[PDB]
Design a protein around this ligand. Structure first.
Ligand SMILES: Cc1oc(C(N)=O)cc1S(=O)(=O)Nc1cnc(Cl)c(C#N)c1
Length: 167
């Protein structure tokens, strides 16, 4: 039993809710919240901009030190950093950005990072400003992640479409 509430069950291990991931994290304080990161950990907009703003920019400060030490992530890769006031940990995961021409097959590699964590609160990778089809992203999620994932979808219209088209 865990504290996630109001989610629709899609599969054995994947759950989904129309929710603001920032507000969801603030209320649940999950062990892991996933950020929709880029390779530079520049949290300017989308989910990343919202999460960073909620930390009063502490996420960005920590991220800049991480990059200065380690260099950029790989597309499809991840790193674990602090969750600040939102979660114990933040798993920064880089899905491909179609608006940069990155290969969409890297989306499966991105979701594989979730399997290193038993339970996660997460957005749909490569959705929103990353330019992928969220229905495709949900399919890859369900077919790749084996751990327990609670997906927060900000847009109600999109949430209803994801549910209604789910196979
Ligand atoms: C309102 C909205 O539109 C779309 C769309 N496909 O156009 C997605 C969303 S979201 O807010 O519900 N989830 C979301 C938002 N931002 C980002 Cl960067 C990601 C990722 N990775 C995921």
């Amino acid at each position: 039993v865990n504290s996630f509430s109001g989610y629709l069950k899609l599969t054995d291990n994947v759950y989904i809710k129309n929710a603001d991931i920032v507000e969801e994290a603030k209320k649940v304080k999950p062990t892991v919240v996933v950020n929709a990161a880029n390779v530079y950990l520049k949290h300017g907009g989308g989910v990343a901009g919202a999460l960073n703003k909620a930390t009063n920019n502490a996420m960005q400060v920590e991220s800049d030190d991480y990059i200065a030490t380690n260099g950029p992530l790989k597309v499809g890769g991840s790193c674990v950093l602090s969750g600040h006031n939102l979660a114990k940990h933040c798993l920064h995961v880089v899905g491909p950005n179609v608006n940069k021409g990155e290969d969409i097959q890297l989306l499966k590699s991105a979701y594989e990072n979730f399997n290193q964590h038993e339970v996660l609160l997460a957005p749909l990778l490569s959705a929103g400003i990353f330019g992928a089809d969220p229905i495709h992203s949900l399919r890859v999620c369900v077919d790749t992640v084996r751990t327990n994932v609670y997906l927060a979808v900000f847009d109600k219209n999109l949430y209803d479409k994801l549910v209604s088209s789910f196979l």
